Amino acid sequence: DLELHAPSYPWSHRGLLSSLDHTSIRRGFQVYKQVCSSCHSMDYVAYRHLVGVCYTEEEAKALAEEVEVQDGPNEDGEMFMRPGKLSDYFPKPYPNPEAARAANNGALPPDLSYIVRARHGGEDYVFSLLTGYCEPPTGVSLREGLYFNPYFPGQAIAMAPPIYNEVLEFDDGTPATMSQVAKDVCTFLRWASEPEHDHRKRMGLKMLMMMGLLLPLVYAMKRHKWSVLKSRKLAYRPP
Amino acid sequence: ELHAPSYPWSHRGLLSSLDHTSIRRGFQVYKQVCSSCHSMDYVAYRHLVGVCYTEEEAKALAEEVEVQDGPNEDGEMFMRPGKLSDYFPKPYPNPEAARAANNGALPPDLSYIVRARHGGEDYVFSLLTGYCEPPTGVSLREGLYFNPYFPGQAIAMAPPIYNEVLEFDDGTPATMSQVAKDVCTFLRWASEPEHDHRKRMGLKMLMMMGLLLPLVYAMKRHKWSVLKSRKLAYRPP
Amino acid sequence: REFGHLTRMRHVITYSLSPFEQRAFPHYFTKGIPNVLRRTRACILRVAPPFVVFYLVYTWGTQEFEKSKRKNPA
Amino acid sequence: REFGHLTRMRHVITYSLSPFEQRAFPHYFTKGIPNVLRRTRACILRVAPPFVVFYLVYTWGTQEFEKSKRKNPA
Amino acid sequence: MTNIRKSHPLMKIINNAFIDLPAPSNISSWWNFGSLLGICLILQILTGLFLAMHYTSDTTTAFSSVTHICRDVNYGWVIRYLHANGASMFFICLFIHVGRGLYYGSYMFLETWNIGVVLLFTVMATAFMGYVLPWGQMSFWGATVITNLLSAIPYIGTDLVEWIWGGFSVDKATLTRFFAFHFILPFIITALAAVHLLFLHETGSNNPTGISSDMDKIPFHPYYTIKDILGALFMMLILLILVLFSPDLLGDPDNYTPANPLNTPPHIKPEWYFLFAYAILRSIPNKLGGVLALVASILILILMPMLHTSKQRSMMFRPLSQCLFWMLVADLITLTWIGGQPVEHPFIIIGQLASILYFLIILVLMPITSIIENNLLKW
Amino acid sequence: MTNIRKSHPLMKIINNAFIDLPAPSNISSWWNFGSLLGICLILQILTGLFLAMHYTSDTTTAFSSVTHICRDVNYGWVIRYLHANGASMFFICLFIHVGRGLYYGSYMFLETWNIGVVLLFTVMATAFMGYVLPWGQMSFWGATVITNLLSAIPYIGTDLVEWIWGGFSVDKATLTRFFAFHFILPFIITALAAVHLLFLHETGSNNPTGISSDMDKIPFHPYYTIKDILGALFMMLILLILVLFSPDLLGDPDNYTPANPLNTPPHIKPEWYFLFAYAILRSIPNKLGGVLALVASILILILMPMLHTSKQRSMMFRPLSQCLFWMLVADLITLTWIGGQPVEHPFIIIGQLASILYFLIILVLMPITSIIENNLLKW
Ligand code: HEM
Ligand code: HEM
Ligand code: HEM
């Protein structure tokens, strides 16, 4: 059996009040679009959420119209195909779950809208997983089609190696090293799971400050109004 | 426009019920006339069992139709014979396709027209039988037909209940009025399948209440009879 | 506000009778009907006129709506 | 249950001072720290032992489990 | 040893509540509508729950779920029609209760009267929302019109409309939030009703004669418990005729149509218990005036305790005022009928006249009649 | 003429319950949790309503609705995680409240103690349904397991289970009825908490010493009200840290996978606050025995006033018994951890001993020890 747990990587957003590197989010979206979107899906995230996080409005619009998304029945009686816009969720790669299972070896690529909030370990898992591919150890013979990943439960993941060195060209020009690609995609997936990650932390900061201020004064109020009982100095004078 | 006339339905009486033979006859009227264009979606072949058709007859009727469900092991839609649980198949995949096939109008979902239209069955019956010729001076765009009972006096229905349209199972002649009455009764049942049971509960309730009111009244008057017979007396000094 | 101290009363005598000995429906029709008629006559004069005014305006309104939605001047 | 039908008490004199002339934090640390140390001394020997034996049980279970999940000569 | 009935806390509260409460002996039938209200509320609390467990408050399944309850649920149609007709009967009983309070001068119990006005407000909001729930054509369009009425308020009236809507129109968020509020509110109604009874107990009920009956009070448990049992059963009689024989007798048939924001129904009305206020709404051409009249038609009950000038608190001995009261009742029924009819000749002028007459009676005729009344009787 | 605080009928109960309520002078912080429960409940009511604002209790859209809350609605994530962590914190304070009651001998108050036991039962049921609502993998599978536990009941087992399910398995009907039940139950908890306070107020309160404080009572308003506010602020601190720095710290990530009735998750552990009973359920090999042990684990609180034999009300002056009580707390923690862990060699036997010792302390060890110091202290 055994379950090799993912080591705790020192992510930039790991800090108590540290938010994700949004430039890393911009880089991590491209790998999802050009690599992970080929078989996987992010159905719960639309192009609208992308603006203001790692893209501006015009780039988001252009990116959305790059793909083609289905709209409702036209005035003739059938589906009419239209380019995407801001209010369209990320395109599904496969028409239905059955098509997804059949197209692959027989497994199902889980949607990544929550894969970081569903896997025990979080980003440290996924990153390590994408970088955990290796030759199976002696005495283990995986079936044709199965690939060996120690971090995957059962060590028999049905995933072709998704990330290899120089898989795609980052627009800004950062090197396409597999480690960089995996790091950026993991940050992007964490953002996808927890979009409020920035604001939450920001809110927490304020909660730390004012409750560091309210708590003494309120306490200072209590000891103020409770001091009468705390300095009673009783006396007994029986006859 | 004129309101619907009060037809003396067999299911009109306070304690009366529908005629299930008529329900069975009207079902084939729906199946062979309405289902080609009209969409009854809220009811299913399961409801047919025990109301007007036995289990095997309903099963055979379901197996006659072909329904689209389920993805195969290749992610494709596959047809299959209708089972006892499939709802009555819609004829148009999308509502706008219904407009496209006709002049642009939508055949309403016949599940609830008896309950949705002001007038109930008496309206829709008069809608089908009460067809007429457009009076002098009335224009009508090609495709529309004149039916006074329809609000607006311009229906988009081709007259569908034309004589000898079908052959009833029992053998009753399928004349205008006969088939129209059967489909109207069937539509009334489809509007609310609990009509028979509703009247049964009402029947029980009528005598249960006619027996509880007197007894509870006697209870109250017996308990209050202490006050209903006090005799106050003033004895000032 | 409970039994015992509501008010003060003196020289009042109240007789009653067990509910198990006197009739539950004493002269329900012999004396009930004339009493019902008297109570009806007491309040009919002050109850009916507002409702017959309603009936008048109702019939006039429905018939006038029917008349208006007709064809004449053409 | 309100003030007045609570008890009977005699010869008990209670002084007090307003909250507006007594410091709300009178020698906070100077007397608080010995007080907290005394309170901790009073109860540590009767509070901690069950928790530390729980800790031992928990850690022991953790390894014993993962050893049971280890390999075995064959 | 002490009797548990008058010593245990909960039993003491219940005992003072409806066991040994000194109530007047001459309490007529019209006071039964008190308890009946709560009974319907209890039933309304009950059946709605059993509806709430087969209702998916989404605009793509709400109507389908309701049809599922009526058709493919064991004795579900009974529950659904019990809910609807129970709402109708609840408002019948509420109107009769308000009429009883107006007639026998029960508004002299100030706090109870104010609490009753609050109950009327919140229960009418609850019923409006509940009628929005089934998501029929009438439901959706009535919701649109009624919420859009709030646009009349200056400056901040526009902003409330989308806030309540949850978007730019009555849509998903409106339906879901209306379900949530319709679920929570009746418990607020229950709390306010408990406070209503609490306030009533400190003075006792008002007999038809109006004069204090502290020398004639009788215990509640043996006499009125059976009387309210009879009343509740008699109410259930009418309710079961409604549900079992003609369930959709009180309700527009167009509601049995999937709501479509592309086709206004030919006939638009609120429920039978709201048409009376809709009449004043359509009476005043000014939109803001219409909304203010809507609020005032109900809120005018708060002014009633002040306007009472007759030295008698009971209407038993006020013939002229009695004729005025019955004219007011006919006025309300006329308003309801006018609200039913479309706004055309001669319904428009009849509606204006009925609205003016209603306000004029409640504000002016009754106090002037009371003053000449007192002058007629040496006081 | 008279203070409105003690003149207004509604103000009477509020003044006698929170303003002029005689409270013990030496009340420790362990009693502040009594407020912390109630306040927390309001947040669960306040947040839980807003979750109900945007929520379609439907198998095909419940999870989508929750994600839309946490991702699209304005600050919806705040409300959602505030609600979940508030429920967890609510159970934290509930356990601390029960511990305080056990320690300072508050179960002598009988009626309040039994009412509190009923409160506990209702709150756990509410939390169960709430965890069912999100319709994740752990939601669905834990619900299936816990409702299948009812099959152990003889004769009526299967029919009762199918009744609760609303069908043949946890599906549309189960979720739809669970949502409505989760809506109604907290109001039952609120009314029962009012009853709890009503029963408590008649016996004052139990100070830490355990001796009657009838002669040292103090007004409630200038005192603990402010201390209760301070406790509520500390509670808000803990809750806000949990929500704002690690929302899913107390929650299994597997719930974020949509509920698929085809894949059993690697672990079916329920929420953190139920494992203490769940572990007991795992301990007894017999299914019916397991269910009886599970229910009796909570029911044992009712027997506590009967089992007490030490002539001192409180635990302040009973050292050996204090060691026993802290052994009980350690046992509860051990049971929670064991329930967290799977059913394997090292954990089965530990669970057996933990359950046995947890029952043994309450039934045998504590009363037998209570005899011992009584003999030790010459009485
Ligand atoms: C104050 C008492 C109540 C009144 C007056 C009331 C009124 C109404 C009305 C008029 C409807 C519309 C019925 C229809 O059009 O078919 C309705 C629907 C509904 N009510 Fe209530 N209601 C009350 C209490 C409750 C409660 C407490 C609940 C929740 C437990 C509830 C849940 C529902 C649901 C789910 C619907 C939609 C089902 C349907 O419309 O058929 N109601 N209510
Ligand atoms: C939520 C619905 C209501 C409930 C459950 C309720 C409950 C009750 C009950 C049980 C009574 C005692 C029986 C009676 O005298 O009729 C009562 C009395 C009263 N209620 Fe209500 N009530 C409601 C609505 C109202 C309304 C809308 C008003 C008017 C604004 C009102 C004003 C009164 C008055 C004035 C009394 C005293 C009657 C008298 O003294 O004769 N109530 N209420
Ligand atoms: C007794 C207090 C309450 C407790 C302990 C409680 C507990 C819970 C818990 C643990 C969840 C699961 C949350 C999650 O897994 O993310 C939940 C969900 C939910 N609760 Fe509550 N709840 C309470 C009161 C309420 C009330 C009063 C309402 C309705 C007004 C409500 C509505 C909901 C809804 C709609 C959900 C599903 C959304 C979600 O998963 O958060 N809750 N509840």
Ligand code: HEM
């Ligand atoms: C719904 C959750 C609950 C609420 C809101 C609640 C409310 C309260 C409040 C406000 C107090 C007074 C403050 C205090 O003494 O701590 C109290 C006291 C008490 N509660 Fe609860 N309670 C709850 C659950 C329970 C439970 C689970 C039990 C145990 C079965 C219980 C038994 C008691 C006892 C014995 C007291 C008296 C404590 C003393 O004064 O010494 N309650 N409750």
